[PDB]
Specification:
By secondary structure, the protein is mostly helical. It has one domain: Non-ribosomal Peptide Synthetase Peptidyl Carrier Protein, Chain A, CATH 1.10.1200.10. Helix 1 packs across helix 2. The longest helix has 15 residues. The protein starts with a helix and ends with a helix. The PDB classes it as lipid binding protein.
Length: about 80
């Protein structure tokens, strides 16, 4: 299993490399477009990055449901 301390830095790292802002400002309850104010491109970027880095199974379906930080962090954290 993977410690939440790892996923936290991991997920945040990507979100930072994709957007380019401070991982801190990125709220967990907030979304990628809701608060972040990003576009569909951002969300999709995080999705692929997850199934690429975390090697998780995030298909179109799971990709449509996972469009928020809390949602993403929840999925990965749940799929240890």
């Amino acid at each position: 299993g993977i410690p939440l301390s790892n996923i936290e830095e991991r997920v945040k790292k990507i979100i930072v490399e994709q957007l380019g802002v401070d991982e801190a400002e990125v709220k967990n309850e907030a979304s990628f477009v809701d608060d972040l104010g990003a576009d569909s491109l951002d969300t999709v970027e995080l999705v692929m990055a997850l199934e690429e880095e975390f090697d998780t199974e995030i298909p179109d379906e799971e990709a449509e449901k996972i469009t928020t930080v809390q949602a993403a962090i929840d999925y990965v954290n749940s799929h240890q």
